[PDB]
Design a protein around this ligand. Sequence first.
Ligand SMILES: Nc1ncccc1NCc1cccc(-c2cccnc2)c1
Length: 377
Amino acid sequence: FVEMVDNLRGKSGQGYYVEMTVGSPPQTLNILVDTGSSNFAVGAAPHPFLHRYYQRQLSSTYRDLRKGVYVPYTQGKWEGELGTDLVSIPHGPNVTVRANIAAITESDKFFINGSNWEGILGLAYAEIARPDDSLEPFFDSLVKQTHVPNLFSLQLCGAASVGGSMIIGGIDHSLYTGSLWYTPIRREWYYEVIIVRVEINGQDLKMDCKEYNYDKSIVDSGTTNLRLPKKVFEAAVKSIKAASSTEKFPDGFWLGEQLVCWQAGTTPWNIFPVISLYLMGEVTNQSFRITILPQQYLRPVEDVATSQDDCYKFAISQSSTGTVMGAVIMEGFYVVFDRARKRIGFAVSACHVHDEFRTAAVEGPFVTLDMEDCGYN
Ligand SMILES: Nc1ncccc1NCc1cccc(-c2cccnc2)c1
């Protein structure tokens, strides 16, 4: 896996991407790594934001499936033509598979102006693939056609340029410290998990644990923030404010719309609480917890011209679609998507940012009863 270490790049807030090659002769592309979707879709036309795009007609191995796709979002979309072609990952395993590829021919509010990726690698399951679940996702093809084990792991680091590792087919011990603990994947669609308890500086937020997963909780490398359901978000914000009473901040800061600034080197990290998410464990009545330091949810904000303070935005935001463990969370941990065994592992990342006195942790076991009732139906 030393060949795979450090194989991801990005820019602050624009995701992590991995290099891939498609077609014969091979066309090199940078592809966003997204555990929140299940299509492999690449720019196939010269949208002005793109550095590179897939040219299907130059590939001797391209096969047109004579079928279109349309993926809408709340405001945007992408649309394109379905096909298959040969695909490799230069800094992944030494194999070449025939995968489905959506050739993006028209899009709106999908690509990011300024980014250095040109497609998306959806790593979640068939159930949420478009146009329907018969369009086999990339990883399913990799596993079906090769001897690569049915798992990948992600160490997201980064800081501005970011870096990380996607270890395909295994776990790399050098990428984490302490122990790996596993939560069940509740259902194979998104990487759905169940959060069973939440503490702030060790103190229970005291909500019905169903609130934590209303209407789902997912691990999503294609979202930056920790996103929390509205009722959970308000309790957490209330509790973080209290812990940090010592200073007052604008309403807008808690909304992600305003920064908070301190003289360089004087950020009062001590007044911001650690957040603990307890996840359903592998054994009946057993759970474990992952601990988030504030340097994960207080996000440094690049350059406000002639300001030599340290300025930060709040990287916890509200969700109406359940809890989302986005890059903010994932950057604290080495995360193992153990598809073969329907489970997701967490261990403290070897590249997590340190606090002067407090230590991130993945710890257990804890006794939590009725953990199934925490799941939303
Ligand atoms: N996984 C995911 N979660 C929320 C929204 C979108 C999404 N995936 C598709 C997608 C499309 C375009 C850009 C991005 C993106 C933008 C910024 C950071 N990471 C991913 C994600």
